[PDB]
Design a protein around this ligand. Structure first.
Ligand SMILES: [Ca+2]
Ligand SMILES: [Ca+2]
Ligand SMILES: [Ca+2]
Ligand SMILES: [Ca+2]
Ligand SMILES: [Ca+2]
Ligand SMILES: [Ca+2]
Ligand SMILES: [Ca+2]
Length: 1489
């Protein structure tokens, strides 16, 4: 096999984000529609479905006296909350019987499932699924029914694919389509959910200052609370709260929080979320959810009491808690109750009882832990803070809270005044005197949980860094990323095999709780499986499938990160605060799992014994948005945590060469921790920040540009590159230098882990503060005084750094940073008042001609509420520019009078280093005041860079469409007789023909400030138009044969053969076929669709020909609409809901652009047919013949042709195509033509060498409909195709028929030889009261009976009786069509199809009972035999399979009279001659009837 890459070629850029997903509220949308319900238990009830999401509920309409109601009612719940509290919001799909405002309704049943279960779906919805309604009152009660519904969760920027909303005619099994996730059994059993609540320790002051705590625990909408331990900082409850809910629970979390029992203003202290998935596994391999008895750590607001607490929401767990509040002993046990046992009390009510007490030894030995801190630097402090001195306080648990009051331990650095770095930032002058802290704490000795989780996160971090390396190597396009992913999977397999030896060495301890046995075995099983799952993915991954298998590796990473989270906390997280003369400012959080010390590296924490760069941020809501862009502090702390009996080597991670200054209590004790360090090893370093060019920056000015300049932060110094004016892609070309910086430590320690550089990009304004486009972080290429400035690592080439303005990306930044150590010879050891970046670091430039096809401008919006009059497009690239011609009037002709004009500009040699090209439209008035109208920047030019080459009379259009749709279904089946077809396309026509942008690319135009997440706007409020055109970027011109593709005209450029620019009148001919899965637009759950079409200035609607009460309509209409291209090009085909009173409501609309369809070489104006004909349903609809089609494409293609020998062959270019020679019309004679073979040539037009293209066939495109009222959701699927024909060719013919019926008359004359039933009273032989029963479609509507011929002794009867059967017919398929309801619960009319056979039966009439069956015959209307002249001529061959009796179709003969037999089974189960009948079959049309 191919080898593996085992080194890191990339990932020097740190992906630090100041605004993670936690805590940020983002607009969530849940949408729920109850379709129907079935089998609901009750007697003459009136069900109304009540759907609640959290704190509010919304009912349906009341249905009368049915156990199977139908609603189809849509509900929209919008909530602007955080994702974690959105996922914990519960849905409460219920059914209420007889709901009214006077008396409370009686609940039939209910069902519960939170939002996060719905969001865990592969496309975040459940489709047409049936919710079992259990009984929340009785656990012994049975199933109370099912409720079909759709539950969908869609967020901001999320788009949803909607499946087919099939009706109940396509019958569905309930038990195979339930509203459950995968793996849960349908008969979910009851289970007691105990939570055992023992004791809390370390509560803060809350009254002024005492605490009166209790615990309130929420689960699945239920709650229970414990007693109140008044005036106790360390309360003892010893109470357990028992729930009773369905297992496994679909609300997969628990809230456990402490609350003050204030008499007026009771409020939380801290909240822990028991994530119920982490403590359980399903199936017989899994185990029941259990936790504890072990402590848990809870976080909230600051412990210092504020009356108007701005962080009160953090006490309730709504964000990332900023300080340690309390620690609570917790437990959980799940026991399945056997509901069939009658002695157990059947209430589901939450109860509180006294728990079984446990000692404190069961949670672990109370060992004492040591945390050591060292503040090496404190830079980038906000200027608004440092008018007073700043301290830093480190607090873990209650330890470190010496200032508030709740070995003499020290927790605060000494106060000092900050020194000014620049206009935005301070820095503390620590220099060589680093302040330090040391704390002593007492925690349980559950280090094994954190050690196993450290091994898990070590494997996960190696895997994630490897996947980021593979992604970056694919993005950079390095050599063979397949080898790199194979090496990553090898390292993942080695890590998974490494866990099996490291997490199993200390199983004999008595502190080993119940959960960390089952969970430990669970992750042993998971990593044991992953140990060869990674090796199978190693054999499966190759070069062509690396992107697909990276998703499987991401699944592996997500599973590993699921495994690494430890639900049983032992040590709380360590908090680092900053206070300005004790007033709290900013905070940070380090997990104590990452600071724990152990002797082998994988179970060692990743942040232990090393200096980590840590950015403080404002607490809570202040850290989001505009208030917290500026960094509150950039620290680099040293932190160590572990046993005090493991304190032998906790200084060795620090930079070397420091004197250790200890306090007065440690004089003479060499093992005493230091109060401060004083460094003595001064090392000198110099940062040259080579920057070339930022790109795609945020727009922070009203003109839509910015004035960018970058502040560079390193240690304690700051410098700026110069301000460039009105550009979002600056070329600064400026190297900054920080000279004679003083680092501390030894040289080789910072080589492989260098310090950080913060690069904040600012928008210079006229006065006051500069605006902010974000920041990026960097790690430099550090060289020493002795190593050579040599290849491959030196000189540093530039790389892109991703800038983030908080959450959203806001540009890239081309830079290379280097730390050069000033050595023994001074600066002479370093190879080299604004300086440019030096050679070898800047990209080498070769000249490129940029040729722009200035086609036109569409949909231009107002500038200063005035319409665009004279637009001119300036295009800029790397400083050079070309100016287009002026549009003289945008209203009449929005196009330029000169096609191609070009300009020369040096560009980088490799295409990855290219700047974005800057198109820009301005309003060019007199006297040079060119205000901006729009601009588009974000593009890559490798898309545009040229590189040189090397009965049959009843057939209709619907028969064609159904033949094509079964061809499409069989093509789906193979991938997962004489009727010609067409290519049905199941998507938009754009996605199979690259939006018809083969030469006419479309660029979207923007103007203005880029909107904020709350106070800003979408990109639809920033679009000011669209520029249609093209680009062609190439080097010094190629040799003569390649240069002949441009050499005819410099005003044409390389766009030789582009069609002309003059406006042309054209007719649009829209055919609408049908629509599927429409959204309910009325209160009845359905709508009244009709077509509404807009194109430029013309609006045509068909509200007089609406379709009533249908969600799957068949339109069958054609629309000949006049348009003037290019002004009237924007078509929007829409469906509208007819309303009897008030106003019509929009159903949906789709955007379809017809300029790209007009001007493409794919010919989307008219699809070519698969076969030629001049008559019938397969008529050629295009006015100009296939010979004209290929002469058009031959002169437009610069290709010789056509050439004709005989009519059966056509030669175009170097290839010869064949086909049939003759054409038939309706009269029946033959005549030769060339159009068949010509059409065969366009069907194979891709075989042409130079301008080979995929011409579209005749087709049924299907566009998804979108609604501005509910964007991002697929409203429906509308089938249509568009034809276009210009007016200066000859006009098209009449539009084709695409628009979406008889009566049989039967006369029964006589009977003979019929079997007999009733014994004679006088003579004793049998007899029959013969009468005839007949129906065509069914006995529901077509049941008709004759008079009774009483007392027949041989079968002879005389009736002369008439039936009538009206019906609809499909002559192509021999199917009778009727319209009827599906069931009693339906509220629509549905079309069905049956075989076209008439049923005739003979019966015996009784005056005291039901009729008795005698015989029957089923007669096909196209194949029933001719009747015999007499009764005795009728034999067995008239009903059996013998061919001796001729067969007659009633649609050709129209009247057949004679005799027929009838058959029924006797006692020997064989069919015999049970009777005969004389009949007459007659046919009339619907017009004759
Ligand atoms: Ca109180
Ligand atoms: Ca500004
Ligand atoms: Ca500005
Ligand atoms: Ca309506
Ligand atoms: Ca309506
Ligand atoms: Ca009878
Ligand atoms: Ca009878």
């Amino acid at each position: 096999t191919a080898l593996t890459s085992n080194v890191s070629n990339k990932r020097s850029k740190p992906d630090i984000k100041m605004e993670p997903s936690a805590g940020r509220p983002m607009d969530y949308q849940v949408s729920i529609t109850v379709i129907e319900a079935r089998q609901l238990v009750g007697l003459n009830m009136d069900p109304v479905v009540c759907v609640e999401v959290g704190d509010d509920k919304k009912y349906t309409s009341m249905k009368e006296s049915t156990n199977c109601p139908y609603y189809n009612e849509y509900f929209v719940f919008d909530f602007h909350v955080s994702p974690d509290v959105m996922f914990d919001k519960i849905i409460k799909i219920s059914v209420i019987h007889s709901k009214n405002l006077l008396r409370s309704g009686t609940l039939v049943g209910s069902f519960k499932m939170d939002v996060g279960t719905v969001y865990s779906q592969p496309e975040h919805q459940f489709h047409h699924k049936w919710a079992i309604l259990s009984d929340p009152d009785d656990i012994s009660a049975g199933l109370k029914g099912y409720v079909k519904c759709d539950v969908a969760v869609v967020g901001k920027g999320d788009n949803i694919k909607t499946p087919h909303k099939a009706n109940e005619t396509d019958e569905d099994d309930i038990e195979g389509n339930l509203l459950l996730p995968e793996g849960v059994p349908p008969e979910r059993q009851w289970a007691r959910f105990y939570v055992k609540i023992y004791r809390a320790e370390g509560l803060p002051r809350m009254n002024t200052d005492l605490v009166d705590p209790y615990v309130q625990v929420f689960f699945a909408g239920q709650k229970g609370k414990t007693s109140v331990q008044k005036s106790s900082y360390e309360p003892l409850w010893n109470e357990q709260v028992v729930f009773t809910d369905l297992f496994p629970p679909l609300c997969k979390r628990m809230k456990v929080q402490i609350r003050d029992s204030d008499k007026v203003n009771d409020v939380a202290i801290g909240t822990h979320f028991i994530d119920l998935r982490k403590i359980s596994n399903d199936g017989d391999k899994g185990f029941l959810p259990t936790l504890g008895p072990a402590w848990v750590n809870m976080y909230g607001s600051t412990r210092n009491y504020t009356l108007l607490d701005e962080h009160q929401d953090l006490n309730e767990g709504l964000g990332e808690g900023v300080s340690f509040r309390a620690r609570l002993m917790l437990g959980l046990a799940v026991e399945i109750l056997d509901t069939s046992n009658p002695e157990l009390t059947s209430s589901t009510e939450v109860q509180v009882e006294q728990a079984t007490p446990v000692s404190e030894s069961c949670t672990g030995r109370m060992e004492e832990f040591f945390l050591f801190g060292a503040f090496l630097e404190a830079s980038m402090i906000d200027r608004k803070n440092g008018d007073k001195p700043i301290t830093f306080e480190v607090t873990i648990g209650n330890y470190g809270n010496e200032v508030d009051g709740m070995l003499a331990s020290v927790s605060s650095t000494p106060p000092m005044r900050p020194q000014i770095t620049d206009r935005n930032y301070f820095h503390l002058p620590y220099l060589e005197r680093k302040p330090c802290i040391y704390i002593k704490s007492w925690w349980p000795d559950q280090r094994r949980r954190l050690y196993n989780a450290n091994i898990m996160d070590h494997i996960a971090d190696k895997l994630e860094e490897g996947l980021n390396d593979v992604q970056e190597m694919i993005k950079t396009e390095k050599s063979y990323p397949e080898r790199r992913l194979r090496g990553v999977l090898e390292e993942l397999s080695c890590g998974c095999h490494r866990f099996l030896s490291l997490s199993d060495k200390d199983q004999g301890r008595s502190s080993r709780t119940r959960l960390d046995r089952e969970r430990l075995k669970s992750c042993m099983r998971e990593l044991e499986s992953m140990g060869q799952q990674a090796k199978s993915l190693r054999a499966q991954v190759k070069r062509h499938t690396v992107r697909d298998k990276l998703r499987s590796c991401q699944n592996f990473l997500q599973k590993l990160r699921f495994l690494a989270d430890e639900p049983q906390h032992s040590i709380p997280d360590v908090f680092i605060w900053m206070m300005s003369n004790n007033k709290r400012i900013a905070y940070a959080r380090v997990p104590s799992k990452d600071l724990l010390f152990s002797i082998v590296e994988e179970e060692l924490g990743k942040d232990c014994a090393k200096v980590k760069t840590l950015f403080l941020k404002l607490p809570g809501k202040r850290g989001f948005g505009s208030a917290g862009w500026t960094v509150q502090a950039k620290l680099e702390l040293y932190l160590w945590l572990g046993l005090s009996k493991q304190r032998k080597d906790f200084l060795c991670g620090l930079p070397c060469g420091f004197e250790e200054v200890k306090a007065a209590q440690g004089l003479g004790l060499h093992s005493f921790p230091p109060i401060s360090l004083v460094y003595t090893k001064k090392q000198a370093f110099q940062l040259r920040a080579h920057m070339y060019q930022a790109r795609s920056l945020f727009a922070a000015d009203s003109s839509g540009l910015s004035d960018p300049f970058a502040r560079v932060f390193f240690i304690n110094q700051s410098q700026c590159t110069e301000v460039l004016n009105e550009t979002l892609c600056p070329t600064w070309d400026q190297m900054l230098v920080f000279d004679n910086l003083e680092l501390y430590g030894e040289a080789h320690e910072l080589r492989d882990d260098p310090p950080i550089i913060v690069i904040e990009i600012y928008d210079q304004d006229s006065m006051g503060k500069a605006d902010f486009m974000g920041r990026t972080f960097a790690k430099p290429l550090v060289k020493m005084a002795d190593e050579a400035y040599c290849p491959p690592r030196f000189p540093p080439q530039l790389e892109y750094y991703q800038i983030y303005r908080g959450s959203a990306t806001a540009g890239d930044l081309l830079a290379a940073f280097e730390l050069l150590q000033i050595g023994p010879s001074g600066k002479a050891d370093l190879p080299p008042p604004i300086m440019p970046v030096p050679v070898g670091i800047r990209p080498v430039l070769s000249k490129y001609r940029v040729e722009v096809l200035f086609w036109g401008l569409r949909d231009l919006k107002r500038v200063n509420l005035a319409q665009v009059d004279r637009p001119r497009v300036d295009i800029e690239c790397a400083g050079k520019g070309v100016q287009s011609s002026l549009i003289h009037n945008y209203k009449k002709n929005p196009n330029f009078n000169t096609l191609v004009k070009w300009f020369e500009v040096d560009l980088p040699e490799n295409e990855l280093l290219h700047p974005p090209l800057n198109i820009r439209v301005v309003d060019c008035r007199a006297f040079g005041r060119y205000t901006l109208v729009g601009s588009h920047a974000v593009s890559s030019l490798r898309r545009f860079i040229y590189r040189p080459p090397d009965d049959e009379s009843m057939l209709d259009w619907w028969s064609k469409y159904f033949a094509s749709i079964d061809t499409m279904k069989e093509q789906l089946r193979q991938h997962e007789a004489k009727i010609d077809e067409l290519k049905v396309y199941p998507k938009e026509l754009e996605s199979e023909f690259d939006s018809f942008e083969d030469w006419l690319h479309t660029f979207n135009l923007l103007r203005g400030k880029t909107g904020d997440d709350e106070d800003g706007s979408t990109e639809e409020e920033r679009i000011v138009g669209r520029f249609k055109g093209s680009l062609c970027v190439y080097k010094v011109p190629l040799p003569e044969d390649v240069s002949r593709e441009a050499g005819y005209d410099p005003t044409y450029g390389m766009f030789q053969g582009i069609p002309s620019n003059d406006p042309i009148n054209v007719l649009v001919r829209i055919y609408v076929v049908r629509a599927t899965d429409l959204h309910p637009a009325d209160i009845n759950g359905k709508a009244d669709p009709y077509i509404a079409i807009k194109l430029g200035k013309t609006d045509i609607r068909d509200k007089e020909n609406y379709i009533s009460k249908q969600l799957n309509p068949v339109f069958g209409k054609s629309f000949d609409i006049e348009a003037s291209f290019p002004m009237e090009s924007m078509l929007t085909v829409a469906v509208y809901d007819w309303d009897l009173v008030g106003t019509d409501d929009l159903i949906g609309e789709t955007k379809i652009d017809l300029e790209n369809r007009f001007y493409s070489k794919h010919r989307a104006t008219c699809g070519i047919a698969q076969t030629y004909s001049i008559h019938g349903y397969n008529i050629w609809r295009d006015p100009m013949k296939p010979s004209q089609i290929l002469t058009r494409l031959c002169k437009e293609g610069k290709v010789d042709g056509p050439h004709f020998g005989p009519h059966g062959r056509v030669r175009v270019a170097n290839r010869v195509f064949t086909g049939p020679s003759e054409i038939e019309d309706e009269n029946g004679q033959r005549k030769p033509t060339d159009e068949h073979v010509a059409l065969s040539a366009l069907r194979h037009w891709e075989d042409i060498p130079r301008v080979g293209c995929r011409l579209v066939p005749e087709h049924v495109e299907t566009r998804p409909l979108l609604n501005p009222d509910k964007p991002g959701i697929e409203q429906g699927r509308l089938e249509l195709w568009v034809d276009m024909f210009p007016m200066d060719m000859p006009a098209p013919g009449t539009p084709l028929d695409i628009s979406p019926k008889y009566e049989l008359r039967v006369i029964v004359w006589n009977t003979d030889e019929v079997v007999l039933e009733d014994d004679d009273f006088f003579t004793g032989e049998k007899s029959s009261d013969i009468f005839v029963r007949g129906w065509l479609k069914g006995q529901q509507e077509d049941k008709q009976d004759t008079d009774v011929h009483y007392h027949s002794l041989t079968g002879e009867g005389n009736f002369n009786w008439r039936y009538l059967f009206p019906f609809d017919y499909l002559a192509a398929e021999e199917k009778i069509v009727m319209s009827k309801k599906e069931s009693m619960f339906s509220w629509d009319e549905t079309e069905y199809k049956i075989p076209a056979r008439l049923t005739l039966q003979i019966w015996d009439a009784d005056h005291f009972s039901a009729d008795d069956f005698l015989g029957a015959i089923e007669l096909d209307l196209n194949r029933f035999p001719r009747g015999a002249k007499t009764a005795k001529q009728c034999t067995m061959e008239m009903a059996t399979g013998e061919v001796d009796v001729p067969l007659v179709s009633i649609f050709k003969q129209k009247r057949v009279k004679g005799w027929w037999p009838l058959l029924a089974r006797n006692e020997n189960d064989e069919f015999e001659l049970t009777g005969k009948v004389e009949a007459e079959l007659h046919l009339l049309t619907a017009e004759e009837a």
